[PDB]
Amino acid sequence: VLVALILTPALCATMLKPIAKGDHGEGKKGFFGWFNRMFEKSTHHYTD
Amino acid sequence: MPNFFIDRPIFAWVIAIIIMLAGGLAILKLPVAQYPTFAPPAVTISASY
Amino acid sequence: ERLSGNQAPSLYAISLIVVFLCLAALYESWSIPFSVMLVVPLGVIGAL
Amino acid sequence: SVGGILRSTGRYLVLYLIIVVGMAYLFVRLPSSFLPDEDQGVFMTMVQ
Numbered sequence A: 001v002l003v004a005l006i007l008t009p010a011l012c013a014t015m016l017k018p019i020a021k022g023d024h025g026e027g028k029k030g031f032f033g034w035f036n037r038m039f040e041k042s043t044h045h046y047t048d
Numbered sequence B: 001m002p003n004f005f006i007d008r009p010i011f012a013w014v015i016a017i018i019i020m021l022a023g024g025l026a027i028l029k030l031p032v033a034q035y036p037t038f039a040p041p042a043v044t045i046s047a048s049y
Numbered sequence C: 001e002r003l004s005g006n007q008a009p010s011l012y013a014i015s016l017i018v019v020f021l022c023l024a025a026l027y028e029s030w031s032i033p034f035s036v037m038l039v040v041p042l043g044v045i046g047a048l
Numbered sequence D: 001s002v003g004g005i006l007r008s009t010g011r012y013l014v015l016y017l018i019i020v021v022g023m024a025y026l027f028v029r030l031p032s033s034f035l036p037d038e039d040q041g042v043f044m045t046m047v048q
């Protein structure tokens, strides 16, 4: 929790890549794209 | 506290390295066993006639 | 004598490292601490 | 004085390394002990 309140935030605000609004990794090439789609589709099923 | 260390990433890294250094040194001086001393202690009285 | 001996360099090595780390946190800089740490010899020359 | 010292700069870094080498020399030459023998106003004589 101390790591998640001190180090983790500091890294997230320095060494994380900017994501464009709407991008949920559904356009990612290869397997990660399929998995991202499967999860987005499964999240919709779950919430319903 | 979170907002404090977002502006101060070096301070955040410093705390992490000191915690790791202390841990690395502790690994060298730490005893090694299968279990702790959990079994109940016993005292035997030996006599001969 | 056979038990341990010459444990000073090992502990003054981490003493240096930890002092540098604490200074880096004070100034929020990996470089500025050196400007403070370079006065160590100025006091040792007088003692010797 | 310092105002002119910060203009020269490179002269005192050569002077600094001399002090470290001078310190380094004295440290090696100076013999090492633990605790000095104190006069305690008492001593003993063995006869064998």
Ligand SMILES: CCCCCCCCCCCCO[C@@H]1O[C@H](CO)[C@@H](O[C@H]2O[C@H](CO)[C@@H](O)[C@H](O)[C@H]2O)[C@H](O)[C@H]1O
Binding pocket: D001, D004, D005, D007, D008, D015
């Ligand atoms: C004593 C053992 C050895 C350790 C010495 C370290 C401590 C230094 C003691 C104080 C000496 C101060 O000496 C100071 O030097 C600087 C730099 O040369 C001089 O500065 C002079 O030369 C510089 C360039 O070299 C010019 O730009 C400047 O206009 C001129 O004034 C000062 O006029 C002088 O006051």
Ligand SMILES: CCCCCCCCCCCC
Binding pocket: B009, B010, B013, B017
């Ligand atoms: C300005 C932040 C620099 C990030 C790099 C820090 C890496 C430190 C790793 C030390 C591990 C022992």
Ligand SMILES: CCCCCCCCCC
Binding pocket: A042, A043, A045, A046
């Ligand atoms: C983790 C996704 C779980 C979604 C279940 C949806 C069930 C659909 C009706 C049988």
Ligand SMILES: CCCCCCCCCC
Binding pocket: B017, C017, C030
């Ligand atoms: C003791 C190990 C950590 C040393 C500090 C490294 C800082 C890198 C800044 C670019």
